[PDB]
Amino acid sequence: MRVTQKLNHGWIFAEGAADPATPLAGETVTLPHNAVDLPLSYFDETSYQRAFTYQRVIAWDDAWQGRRVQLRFDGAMADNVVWVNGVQVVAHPDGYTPFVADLTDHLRPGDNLVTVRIDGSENPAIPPFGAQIDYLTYAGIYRDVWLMVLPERHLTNARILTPDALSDAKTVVIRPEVTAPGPVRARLLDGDREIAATEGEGELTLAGLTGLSLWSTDNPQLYTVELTLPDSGDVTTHRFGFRTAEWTPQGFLLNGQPMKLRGLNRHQSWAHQGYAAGRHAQERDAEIVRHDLCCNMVRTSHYPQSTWFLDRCDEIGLLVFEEIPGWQHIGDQAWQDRSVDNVRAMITRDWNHPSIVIWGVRINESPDNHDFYVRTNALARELDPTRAIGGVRCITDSEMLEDVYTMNDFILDESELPLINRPRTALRPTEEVTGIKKPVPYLVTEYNGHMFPTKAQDPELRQMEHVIRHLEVLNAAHGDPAISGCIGWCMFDYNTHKDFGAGDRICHHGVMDIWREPKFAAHAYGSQKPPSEGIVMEPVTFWARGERNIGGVLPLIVLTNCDEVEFECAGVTRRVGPDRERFPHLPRPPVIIDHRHISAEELGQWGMSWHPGRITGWLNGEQVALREYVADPLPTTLQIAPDRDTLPADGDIDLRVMLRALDQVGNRLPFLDAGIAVTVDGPARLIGPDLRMLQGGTTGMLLRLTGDAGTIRITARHPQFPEAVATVTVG
Amino acid sequence: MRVTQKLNHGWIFAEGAADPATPLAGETVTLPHNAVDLPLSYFDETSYQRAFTYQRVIAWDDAWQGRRVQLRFDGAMADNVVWVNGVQVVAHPDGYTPFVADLTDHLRPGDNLVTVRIDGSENPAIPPFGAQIDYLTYAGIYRDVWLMVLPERHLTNARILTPDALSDAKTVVIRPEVTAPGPVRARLLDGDREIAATEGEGELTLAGLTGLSLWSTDNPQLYTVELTLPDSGDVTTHRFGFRTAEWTPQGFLLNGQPMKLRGLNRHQSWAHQGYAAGRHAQERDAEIVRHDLCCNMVRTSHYPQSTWFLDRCDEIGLLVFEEIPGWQHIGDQAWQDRSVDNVRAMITRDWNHPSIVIWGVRINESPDNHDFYVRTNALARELDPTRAIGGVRCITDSEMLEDVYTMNDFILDESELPLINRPRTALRPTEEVTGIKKPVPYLVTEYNGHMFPTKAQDPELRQMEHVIRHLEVLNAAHGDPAISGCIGWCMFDYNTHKDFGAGDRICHHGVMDIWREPKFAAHAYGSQKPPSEGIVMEPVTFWARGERNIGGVLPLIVLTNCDEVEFECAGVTRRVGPDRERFPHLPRPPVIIDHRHISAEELGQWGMSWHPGRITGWLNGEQVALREYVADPLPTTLQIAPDRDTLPADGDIDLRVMLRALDQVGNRLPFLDAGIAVTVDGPARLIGPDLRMLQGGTTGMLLRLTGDAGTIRITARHPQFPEAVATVTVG
Ligand SMILES: OC[C@H]1O[C@@H](O)[C@H](O)[C@@H](O)[C@H]1O
Ligand SMILES: OC[C@H]1O[C@@H](O)[C@H](O)[C@@H](O)[C@H]1O
Ligand SMILES: OC[C@H]1O[C@H](O)[C@H](O)[C@@H](O)[C@@H]1O
Ligand SMILES: [Cl-]
Ligand SMILES: [Cl-]
Ligand SMILES: [Cl-]
Ligand SMILES: [Cl-]
């Protein structure tokens, strides 16, 4: 057979450009690596825009004679090139798509010298460069690498296909790809239970499929296709799922039934480390998206992302939008050629993930460009008749070659501007935008963001308007049948170029911060889930008397699953239901507590003094939830929150750990400006500042495991707080 | 020749209450002192509500026989008592006023023990306690102590009258207060020179003095009176000035010439050390109003303050408004009694400061009290006819027993409450607020604060509004002649109780931070000075792109005293002046730059990249103020600016030292969350911790000098910043 085999241990990293054949000397690392570890805010950002060599050593194996030996690189940013005992074996410019390097014909006995060039700089013949970008690219080898040892005659990709997916007698078709002719053979699998099999050169088929269940956002049922080549014993497997995803102007319909998309954009970027984050860490994002913020769709801003991520979206029933790399700029016809190669490299790679339902074949917010775009549109339409074609824009009146008019609607809010008559309007009617009163399939890919930046620690009062603005929009969409869904700007706070942000190198556009800890808006999104799916009730305050203008906590937003919510404090008491008279169209509108339900006279015409409080949620009058606010919060618990207490002896893993400063009854302390000093022992490295600074009463950190067994042990100290510790076992 | 040694040293401090006879082991400490030293935020505030003790090692002298020995306690909080070798010479409850302890009798050869039981409990019987308060009282003998060996015949007090401040030849009337009837000699003098003398039975007059100066805000001329007793040889100095404060429905009058009053409110709360800070520091605060904020007035909120401050304001041309300790609450007979007693203690102490021009005899913002106030009112006026009187309120139609109707117009912004017609108003028409058909002296004493809170870290848009509102008030006040000027709430943010603030024990109301470092809205008071003193030009922005909703920094505020202002960026260039249309009545309306000066498309030039700017300021064609912002702020200089290079070798002095995280071209990094690891060697302790947090890009500390001489090496470091070292010499 074959032996696909990770090989991320034992790489030599060196700042610069070294003679490729002489044993390189430099620092020793395990992949994924990120060449230039950054601060959190206020940094150079070009620091990384330079040369870097990595190297690896591989001894001949008596076991490999006349078998191929290839390095699959899952990815590396950017302008890449590969050597083998000093001979160049692949140049691959794009820093998002993978590439193979064949070693065979330059391996000699004993150890051999594989060498790798990275130039991490904004090389305008490589997309997405040659102008500004509101996101950072970093550099290094930031994805996996795999030592494959393949037979001569062997198997390089397959497309699995689903004609009449909603037949009770389902159907499966496979197009293998190979290096010579010869019988190809294959096996449908559900767990270890063999469902079917066929045999043949060309398109293998299986039909009349009694007994299988459909992939969905509820039910992510996956199935597997083993492929063998009889005449060399090569074998491979591909997962896929049975599902339909139509974009008819009347709406979007999965598997027949219609479905309004809620959703958020996601970068693959972390603090300090950039894109050097592996299977686990990635697997998280997706999980948080689907569950925490309960979206039925993600979009990959503004490139292809990790296979690991896309795997995960498959496994948890989360829809996807996947876009070629770009950010509003087009270069010359050379670059257009380059750009049209990514389309190929992108779709070919991910034409089997059932999660992906649409493709992005426009550069982000670019002008029209008939002659180019014609190409990309043509190109996927052939590479994949199955998934619908789409692109992104922010002008109205565009040259829709694409199947679905996928716009960014930043109308909220321009009442604000001094020249504007348009009364504050959340989204536009579809034909203002589309330039055709002919109905067409229509989605909104981003909104808000730079329109209303909102920092972790921004005033109680601001973070209200912030949340409300996410509601106003979600409520716009769900109302209009014309609009298939929405997708807000954005999932978390990212590092950017100097050109954007608060000039701190941060766009503060998340609903969670950069650690994936949620700011108040997270429970607009997270709160549209059903109670069956989990029970949600956050009030949107810190229960501070004179934190707001004037003071008190009214009006009060409670974000929730529940019929009703109880205000209880100072002797005063009210039940209140969700505010349809302001948010008809939301699945789970939130509760507003108002003059309507209370006056300042009931609390008692500002009878000075501040009293603790108590909120409860209700579900067919069964007291489901309860959140308490002390009137005088003192530091009590210095929380230490690893996502997991247990992990395997795995080097790849990046462990996210959160930290909170909590008052008596549990709530976070939102304004303690301070730094938590921390230690970490046993088989992780911390990544970043040993001193960690709170924002919103909170921060987090990742711990790049060393791959060896042990217990990891973690202090966190601050002279207001009893001395905190936590541990997890490794192996 | 009296001996008046000054003995804040050699003291002993402990928690709880010993028998006042015997030895007491507690640490060798110095005064001013705070009993239990607090965090900057989120702490107990009941921490200091226990008994403590101060005992002293005092020696007899052969030098002292037939000569009264007396410790003078200049101020201490609270419920304070004295014992000499276990016998009790004085009770005083009230922790803002001075009180005397006569040991004389209770003395023996060798070493006599002196004790002080003090307790920081909010005793309901004791003004200022009862119920709630928006400030902390702390504990500690936070002020001075003096030892005084007196002749048995002696001068306890005197009062300096000044009829005809204005006449070309000037009287000085003197009314010494002496233990025994008998002769008293009075030499007026100019710091060095004589001017006249007089001996006297009874009342001492110095009529006819030609060629002396009026004391005014413009120029502070002081003169000292010197009192001898020939009988006992007792000697004391009293200092005063030659002024006239007329208050009239027409307006406030100083030496006849009219004056729109303009000022802010003030606490002795320091961060960490509470009330306990030394002369030098007390002075610096009087200094930072008058000189930086060009403020002609200050309100000692809410109690009497250090004579070290009150001296300072006589010295530097800063009028004063002082009042009895208190906060809305009114006690039983006992406590009201304690108050008229507190009026008495206050006037008697400060009847000779020219700076002071008005007495707050009403408990701050109480509801009216016929029986109780007619008392304080009537009382004060019998103690002091020379000056006028008001008492602070927030309620209308009020029993005006006072000379001046002192009002807290927080009208702005009340319409933000939904149950409100009234369209936005900065100040109420006097007519309505008094409910007195006749016009009467009106002064606005507080405004803003809790109406619009603003952390120093808070975002541009909020900051511009802070500023806006501050300006809006000042304008109105200058605009209406029935209003005799006004006073902003407040100078700096002050530590506080659980019923008030952001939950963190701060009320974020200062136009400066708690370290007397300016927020943007400090330059609204700063830019009212005539250029001919100094030149101020301060834009309001951080010059980051995505910081404000949408982006850019238009419209822009520049706060100035200049004919013109020239804005420059990416080849757009414009002269702009005072927006006088928006603030007709102001002295230095500021420059605003908006759509009327730079159009929509004219921004089109800029493309998508972000650009350096330069704001130049002008004065009669000459170019005065330049201000450079760049677009890619990096960590450049971590600044350490002490108040002073060179100093006295002096135990009392508390040196303020500021810190600043700075970019290339001068500017601060407003959203740079990081602690600065500090260290101090040289002859002084550091008040607060090693690690100080950059709030708003800045952060402050205070070093208490030891009394030793020499070289204070202070060090800041942080890893994004070049390590920095600053010195200050001591002698
Ligand atoms: O709201 C800010 C956003 O604007 C979008 O149009 C762009 O694609 C994003 O990366 C980000 O710049
Ligand atoms: O509500 C709290 C604040 O506002 C004023 O009404 C009061 O006089 C101030 O002392 C301050 O404490
Ligand atoms: O025990 C805590 C709670 O008890 C009481 O029910 C009070 O009404 C509530 O405000 C308080 O927080
Ligand atoms: Cl079959
Ligand atoms: Cl129409
Ligand atoms: Cl009486
Ligand atoms: Cl005087």
PDB file of N, CA and C in Angstrom, chain B residues 30 100 139 144 205 207 221 315 323 394 441 446 456 462 496 506 527 532 581 606 628 633 643 692:
ATOM      1  N   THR B  30       5.857  57.674  59.782  1.00  0.00           N
ATOM      2  CA  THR B  30       5.902  59.141  59.752  1.00  0.00           C
ATOM      3  C   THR B  30       4.569  59.613  59.263  1.00  0.00           C
ATOM      4  N   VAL B 100      -6.663  70.836  69.529  1.00  0.00           N
ATOM      5  CA  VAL B 100      -5.450  70.987  70.406  1.00  0.00           C
ATOM      6  C   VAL B 100      -5.440  70.032  71.626  1.00  0.00           C
ATOM      7  N   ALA B 139      -8.701  56.692  56.738  1.00  0.00           N
ATOM      8  CA  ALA B 139      -8.332  56.924  58.109  1.00  0.00           C
ATOM      9  C   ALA B 139      -6.897  57.348  58.071  1.00  0.00           C
ATOM     10  N   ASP B 144      -0.471  67.099  59.219  1.00  0.00           N
ATOM     11  CA  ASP B 144       0.523  67.498  60.179  1.00  0.00           C
ATOM     12  C   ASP B 144       0.173  67.354  61.691  1.00  0.00           C
ATOM     13  N   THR B 205      -5.044  99.053  64.978  1.00  0.00           N
ATOM     14  CA  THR B 205      -5.360  99.721  63.726  1.00  0.00           C
ATOM     15  C   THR B 205      -4.006 100.138  63.118  1.00  0.00           C
ATOM     16  N   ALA B 207      -3.789 102.567  60.126  1.00  0.00           N
ATOM     17  CA  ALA B 207      -4.424 103.445  59.152  1.00  0.00           C
ATOM     18  C   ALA B 207      -3.385 104.157  58.276  1.00  0.00           C
ATOM     19  N   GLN B 221      -0.672  89.970  45.556  1.00  0.00           N
ATOM     20  CA  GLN B 221       0.186  90.658  46.501  1.00  0.00           C
ATOM     21  C   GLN B 221      -0.146  90.210  47.873  1.00  0.00           C
ATOM     22  N   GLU B 315      -1.309  82.557  47.003  1.00  0.00           N
ATOM     23  CA  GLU B 315      -0.001  82.877  46.395  1.00  0.00           C
ATOM     24  C   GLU B 315       0.048  83.003  44.936  1.00  0.00           C
ATOM     25  N   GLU B 323     -16.306  74.878  52.136  1.00  0.00           N
ATOM     26  CA  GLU B 323     -17.496  74.480  52.874  1.00  0.00           C
ATOM     27  C   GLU B 323     -17.301  73.371  53.898  1.00  0.00           C
ATOM     28  N   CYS B 394     -29.197  71.060  44.741  1.00  0.00           N
ATOM     29  CA  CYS B 394     -29.621  70.705  43.434  1.00  0.00           C
ATOM     30  C   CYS B 394     -31.120  70.881  43.287  1.00  0.00           C
ATOM     31  N   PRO B 441     -28.022  86.861  43.507  1.00  0.00           N
ATOM     32  CA  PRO B 441     -26.751  86.296  42.984  1.00  0.00           C
ATOM     33  C   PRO B 441     -26.814  84.764  42.722  1.00  0.00           C
ATOM     34  N   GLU B 446     -21.744  72.891  40.067  1.00  0.00           N
ATOM     35  CA  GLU B 446     -21.437  71.541  39.565  1.00  0.00           C
ATOM     36  C   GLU B 446     -22.286  71.280  38.325  1.00  0.00           C
ATOM     37  N   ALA B 456     -10.626  57.249  30.797  1.00  0.00           N
ATOM     38  CA  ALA B 456      -9.553  57.912  30.069  1.00  0.00           C
ATOM     39  C   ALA B 456      -9.168  57.061  28.916  1.00  0.00           C
ATOM     40  N   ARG B 462     -16.949  59.357  22.083  1.00  0.00           N
ATOM     41  CA  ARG B 462     -17.424  59.671  23.432  1.00  0.00           C
ATOM     42  C   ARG B 462     -16.678  60.880  24.002  1.00  0.00           C
ATOM     43  N   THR B 496     -14.106  55.925  45.440  1.00  0.00           N
ATOM     44  CA  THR B 496     -15.455  56.054  46.070  1.00  0.00           C
ATOM     45  C   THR B 496     -16.082  54.742  46.675  1.00  0.00           C
ATOM     46  N   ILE B 506     -14.327  53.655  41.316  1.00  0.00           N
ATOM     47  CA  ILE B 506     -14.076  54.952  40.667  1.00  0.00           C
ATOM     48  C   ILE B 506     -15.347  55.563  40.053  1.00  0.00           C
ATOM     49  N   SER B 527      -7.540  75.802  27.122  1.00  0.00           N
ATOM     50  CA  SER B 527      -7.566  76.737  25.986  1.00  0.00           C
ATOM     51  C   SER B 527      -8.449  77.945  26.215  1.00  0.00           C
ATOM     52  N   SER B 532      -1.113  85.195  25.173  1.00  0.00           N
ATOM     53  CA  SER B 532      -0.012  85.988  25.754  1.00  0.00           C
ATOM     54  C   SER B 532       0.590  85.420  27.065  1.00  0.00           C
ATOM     55  N   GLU B 581     -19.849  80.741  15.471  1.00  0.00           N
ATOM     56  CA  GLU B 581     -21.292  80.570  15.271  1.00  0.00           C
ATOM     57  C   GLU B 581     -21.821  79.556  16.330  1.00  0.00           C
ATOM     58  N   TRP B 606      -7.915  60.105  -1.234  1.00  0.00           N
ATOM     59  CA  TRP B 606      -7.103  59.402  -0.273  1.00  0.00           C
ATOM     60  C   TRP B 606      -6.944  57.915  -0.657  1.00  0.00           C
ATOM     61  N   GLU B 628       2.255  67.091  14.970  1.00  0.00           N
ATOM     62  CA  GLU B 628       2.514  65.978  14.030  1.00  0.00           C
ATOM     63  C   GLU B 628       1.863  64.703  14.511  1.00  0.00           C
ATOM     64  N   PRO B 633       1.937  54.420  14.282  1.00  0.00           N
ATOM     65  CA  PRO B 633       2.582  54.520  15.603  1.00  0.00           C
ATOM     66  C   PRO B 633       3.269  53.236  16.047  1.00  0.00           C
ATOM     67  N   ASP B 643       7.836  65.719  38.268  1.00  0.00           N
ATOM     68  CA  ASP B 643       7.581  67.176  38.432  1.00  0.00           C
ATOM     69  C   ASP B 643       8.920  67.957  38.508  1.00  0.00           C
ATOM     70  N   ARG B 692       2.839  49.267  37.175  1.00  0.00           N
ATOM     71  CA  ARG B 692       1.787  50.321  36.938  1.00  0.00           C
ATOM     72  C   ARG B 692       1.122  50.262  35.531  1.00  0.00           C
TER      73      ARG B 692
END
